[PDB]
């Protein structure tokens, strides 16, 4: 019954992946941010400049003050507001209502963007990082513990809408085969990456630094976000591929975006990436390869050119490695919590380079995967 949750997301990389959702008795219909990175959900629940709709309690028959309030704070961006319950339904998602616990912001710094077109985030990951603490029941927790959805859903993010499968797997979103990576611990979707390449030449580096101090599945990231020494040495490899031309280095730090005349973006001097993810069998692992259509971010001209003008989409972390939207566009990713495992294949709306294809490959031997978890 999957094909009326085809397409039910709208949104873009940069922007953020939203679906449509209703609060309340009688329902109010809101657009809400898809965020496997976190576990709170929460939506506007007072006026705001960038809101042109938001949560009124009031008007709902249905909600319940838990009279406590809570603070959640992320890489970017971050909100105050009240605790309650009410009840939540998906639209274009399964044919069932829910009790769940609702953050309704009252206050916010940096967190909603103007003409994002979304009044609230849906925070997919595990209790563990739930604010206050794991006590307050994530949505989906509350989803699979109320009804009879089973415990997984799946995302299919198409850059320059997409779509959440919710309690299964399309088989129509995806070709080729399904690989399967552990989730390390349910906390955020943890997983170990194992090995780097850059055009097929390995990084060469202790594999803990790729996990340092943590990597994770977040659809409410744009970037491809790597620790200091991962990302130093990623920009370089990219660099010296790129050499034949010339960039601004505030290109290099996400900030100014290059331009080329319309259709002569030359693709073929930025190189392939290629992480590869511990399996799901003893020595074995997988590898994604990502093209640079995927982290070359194409952003509006900042001029009356007809060019095409790019953000570079890989950034430096603090806080580990984050598998971004722009990783996540072009692969359905399966986020498999009845088998604590998450899922990549080649989605259907994958970006056509012209001798170059991402892709999902195995298997491969990587002996020790264990010693690549940072502790
Ligand atoms: C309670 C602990 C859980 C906290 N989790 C996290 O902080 C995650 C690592 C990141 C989150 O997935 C978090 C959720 S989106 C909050 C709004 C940001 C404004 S910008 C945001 C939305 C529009 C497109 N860019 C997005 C982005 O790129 N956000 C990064 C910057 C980020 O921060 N994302």
Redesign the pocket.
């Known amino acids: 019954s999957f094909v009326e949750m085809v397409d039910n997301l709208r949104g873009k ?4 992946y939203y679906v449509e959702m209703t609060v309340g008795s009688p329902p109010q219909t809101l657009n809400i ?1 898809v ?6 959900f929460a939506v506007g629940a007072a006026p705001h400049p960038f809101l042109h709709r938001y949560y009124q309690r009031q008007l709902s028959s249905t909600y319940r003050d838990l009279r406590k309030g809570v603070y ?6 971050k909100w105050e507001g009240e605790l309650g319950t009410d009840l939540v339904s998906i639209p274009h998602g399964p044919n069932v209502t829910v009790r769940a616990n609702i953050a309704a912001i009252t206050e916010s710094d ?2 909603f ?1 103007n003409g ?1 077109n979304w009044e609230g ?1 849906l ?1 997919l ?1 595990y209790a563990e ?3 206050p603490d794991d006590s307050l029941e994530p949505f989906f927790d509350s989803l699979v513990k109320q009804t009879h959805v089973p415990n997984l859903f799946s995302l299919q993010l198409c850059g320059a809408g997409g779509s959440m499968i919710i309690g299964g797997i399309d088989h129509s979103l995806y070709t080729g085969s399904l690989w399967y990576t552990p989730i390390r611990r349910e906390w ?1 979707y943890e997983v170990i990456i194992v090995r780097v390449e850059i055009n097929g030449q390995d990084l060469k580096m202790d594999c803990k630094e790729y996990n340092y101090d943590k990597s ?1 599945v ?6 491809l976000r790597l620790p200091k020494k991962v990302f130093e040495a990623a920009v370089k490899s990219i660099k010296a591929a790129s050499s034949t031309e010339k960039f601004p280095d505030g290109f290099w730090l996400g900030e100014q975006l290059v331009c080329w005349q319309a259709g002569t973006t030359p693709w073929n001097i930025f190189p392939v990436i290629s992480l590869y993810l511990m399996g799901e069998v003893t020595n074995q692992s997988f590898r994604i390869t990502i093209l640079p259509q995927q982290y070359l971010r194409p952003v509006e001209d900042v001029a009356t050119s007809q060019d095409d003008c790019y953000k570079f989409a890989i950034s430096q972390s603090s ?1 580990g490695t ?1 598998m ?1 939207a722009v990783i996540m566009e072009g692969f359905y990713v399966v986020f498999d919590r009845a088998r604590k495992r998450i899922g990549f294949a080649v989605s259907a709306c994958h970006v056509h380079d012209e001798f170059r294809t991402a892709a999902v490959e195995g298997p491969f031997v990587t002996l020790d995967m264990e010693d690549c978890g940072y502790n």
């Open positions: 990389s940069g922007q953020g941010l965020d496997t990175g976190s576990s709170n959640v704070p992320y890489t970017q961006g940096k967190f963007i994002s985030i925070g990951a990082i739930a604010r955020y994770i977040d659809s409410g990231t744009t970037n806080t984050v971004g």
